[PDB]
Amino acid sequence: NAVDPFELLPPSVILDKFPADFQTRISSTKWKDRVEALEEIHNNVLKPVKKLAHKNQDYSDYLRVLANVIQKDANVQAVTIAANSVQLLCNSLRSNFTRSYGAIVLVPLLERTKEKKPSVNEAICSALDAVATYCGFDDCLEETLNYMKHKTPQVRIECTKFLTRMLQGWKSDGPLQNQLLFKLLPEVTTAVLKIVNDTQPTTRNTGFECFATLMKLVGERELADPLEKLDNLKKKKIYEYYEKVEV
Amino acid sequence: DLGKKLLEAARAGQDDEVRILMANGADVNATDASGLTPLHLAATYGHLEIVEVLLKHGADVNAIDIMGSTPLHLAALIGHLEIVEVLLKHGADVNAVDTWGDTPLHLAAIMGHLEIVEVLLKHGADVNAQDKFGKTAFDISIDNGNEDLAEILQK
Amino acid sequence: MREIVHIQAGQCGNQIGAKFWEVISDEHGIDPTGSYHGDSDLQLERINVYYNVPRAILVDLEPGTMDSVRSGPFGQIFRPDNFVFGQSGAGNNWAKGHYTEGAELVDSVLDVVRKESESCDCLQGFQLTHSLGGGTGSGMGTLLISKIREEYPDRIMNTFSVVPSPKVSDTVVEPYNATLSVHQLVENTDETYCIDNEALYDICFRTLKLTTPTYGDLNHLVSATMSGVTTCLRFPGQLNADLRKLAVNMVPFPRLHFFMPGFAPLTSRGSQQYRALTVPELTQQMFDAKNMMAACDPRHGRYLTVAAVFRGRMSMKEVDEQMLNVQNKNSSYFVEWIPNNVKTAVCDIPPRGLKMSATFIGNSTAIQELFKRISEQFTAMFRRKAFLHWYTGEGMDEMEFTEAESNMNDLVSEYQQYQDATAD
Amino acid sequence: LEQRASHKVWKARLNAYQELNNLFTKSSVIPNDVANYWLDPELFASYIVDSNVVAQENAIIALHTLLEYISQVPNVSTSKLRLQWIPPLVEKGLSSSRAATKAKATDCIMLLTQSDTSI
Lengths: 247, 155, 424, 119
Ligand SMILES: Nc1nc2c(ncn2[C@@H]2O[C@H](COP(=O)(O)OP(=O)(O)O)[C@@H](O)[C@H]2O)c(=O)[nH]1
Ligand SMILES: [Mg+2]
Known about the structure:
The structure is cut from a larger assembly and holds two copies of chain A, one copy of chain B (155 residues) and one copy of chain C (424 residues). Helix content of chain A is 63%, strand content 0%. Chain A is mainly α and 247 residues long. The longest helix of chain A has 18 residues, at 201-218. Chain B is mainly alpha-helical and 155 residues long. Chain B has one domain (1-155): Serine Threonine Protein Phosphatase 5, Tetratricopeptide repeat (Alpha Horseshoe), CATH 1.25.40. Chain C folds into three domains: 1-252, Tubulin/FtsZ, GTPase domain (Rossmann fold), CATH 3.40.50; 253-366, CATH 3.30.1330.20; 367-424, Helix hairpin bin (Helix Hairpins). Chain C has helices spanning 10-28, 41-44, 64-70, 94-118, 136-151, 174-188, 197-207, 215-229, 231-234, 243-250, 279-283, 316-328, 368-383, 388-393, 398-419; strands at residues 3-9, 56-60, 83-85, 123-131, 156-163, 191-196, 258-259, 263-264, 303-311, 342-347, 357-364. The two termini of chain C are 39 Å apart. Chains in contact: A-C, A-D, B-C. Magnesium ion is lined by residues 10-11, 62, 89, 134, 136 of chain C.
């Protein structure tokens, strides 16, 4: 007995909804112009709907201006309401963000994990979770690693927590020649150890989960090689999470 | 609603447009969401002519809101000495209490409005009045290192 | 660990900031043109710390402040590029300084910070002067701090933050601004000197007998304190030499890094002090709460760590004796579970116009009194929800106030915990 | 080196069999190209008939742990293995007078029997 996708429900189109005074309001110098412009389409145009139009709808003009703010916009509020827009698209339009869409917002989002305001990290991470659950691990696996290597302490801990989030919901079943194994020891492990051996404890402690969520996926015997090279003292922290963690 | 426009004006402080709205018979004691009359709002933000205009048109000088705040509370909190004496002259409740147990004397003492403290005191403020936690205006001066206020409270 | 980048933000920031540069320029023998007319090597021994010309960046949304600095005495010395100023002012709105207007400008400032850091042999850390009840010094300063913290996480962040008091400005939104700013400093700075205007007025009024203190009068006490606490940093010396070592021996718990500064002797603006004090007299200006720049009673709490800086020619033998004395004769006031928590250092070059002086940096749990005052004023204001539409209009959420309120109260509780702690 | 598994002296072959037995515990489930004791099964067919009773038994317990390290995917090449291996295992492992040399040879055949589709 197979199940249904409830997604069969007819789709809705939002392109006609946008107003003429939208592009200039988002591309304005006055912060409240931008905020209201974004906030309007979120509360009026996206939040109501429950399924966007798959057929013949190009959002990669709208999505690249959400990225422009999420990355560069100095107003943390305009970021927050934008990443919640990005999530809504990726959520109400599942199976759309194959590359052009997903990749247009991916590396901007990972840059902005730098934000430490709880509400904002909430919105950015949850949107990263959206682009992941419908594009995992297309571009994110590689680019997530890149930003674990980044200089800002916050982006390290948050992009590593991201790999942890993704890894718990990592999916089967090809052969064991998925993108995770092709780059497992070469890249994933070499980069997770950089987190495990960070100067900060709160950083290191994210690596300890992100390594014990890794062993859970790919066998505590396969990775016993870099386990030995690790401190006996760090080892029992890694094992601590291994015993609690589920994927 | 004409009672809601009179709140917008009395708050933001457009002295002239109060007279316009009141000449259209607006409710002088119109309540907003949280029970705040225009007299509350003008007394918070220091619009002396708007206070005296509303009072002489029959504004409830001792009106409370959803939290038991009278306009004299809010004037003594923010520190509007001009308005405090206008309210008191129009029969304000010098020893009014709000939901947290504070009197206007509590708020003027906490915010360091020594000039308003003395005015309230001379209108028969309760110096020994306590709040929820059990603290008087005198305890606040002891707790807040304000020897200038301790002397003004025992005068 | 050599160079220090200095920043001043807001009106107060640039006022006590410039005053500080006035004081230590003289002490190091620099004229307003930027030329050495001293007569000692101990003056240019560690001039590379604060100078290149000052390593100072001047910041304000208020453009007028620009001129108030340059039209001052040592206003000519500051690098023209290091002036970074906005068009309008923040108007006592922390949200405008932290989220809206101050955020738009903060990039320009970081560009200059980068420029000055770029040409440093080995950076120590940063030094920000600002007021906490304002909109710019508090809102944009704390935003600047975080922005540096993440761009320079391997460096120290050291602030001279001045606390608002009704005795100096009757603006009632200052409790909001200062509470929001303390919520930042406890997470973003390694060490913070708490300059309390309440205490500066109480010293100018009661001890110095000035019936109306001006800013200049309060700023005199501040600039003299700053040169005192930075004496170790600016002259050769074994103890508390660099910013990190200082914080290492001053801050036992990361959140409890709010120092109660105080120094002696207390002088007026250019008055004469006949008979220079003796070593035991200076030492007895430590517990003397009338010398604390923060309005707190050290008697009402316990010292976690203490740094003493004696300036002038005097007996190192006698200073050691007096400090070893005053510690054990008040043994119940110094925490027992941190042995040798008081540290003393001497510098032979005295402060300007005085033969001897002594500055008393202390991590005292009594500082909770200061945060109590701010929180009660904040809560009184916040429970009636006054002036919230200012902050919320600039994109802030009402929740933030609750979090800052709660976070400051956790900070007060923590101080109370370690005060009641026992070694047993 | 590994090529010492066919060295003249017995105690050096005895090492390589222990070295191998570690390899099959400690190496990769997916498996290193160094794990090429499948596509030349003549190697272990030789090792099982070692010409030294002590180094023989150690080759059989290396074959044994090899032959259970191979219960990971994809090893459909167990047909070739039974042909090459159980005749040496039967002829000279079951044959053996040695308690442990025999017991592990039977266990090996077991593991080759369940590699197969049937008996
Ligand atoms: N000690 C001292 N305090 C000041 C000075 N100027 C302002 N303040 C205090 O700082 C607060 C006002 O903030 P201010 O720095 O003027 O606003 P900003 O320009 O937006 O940072 C109030 O608590 C004032 O008492 C000064 O020159 N010296
Ligand atoms: Mg200002």
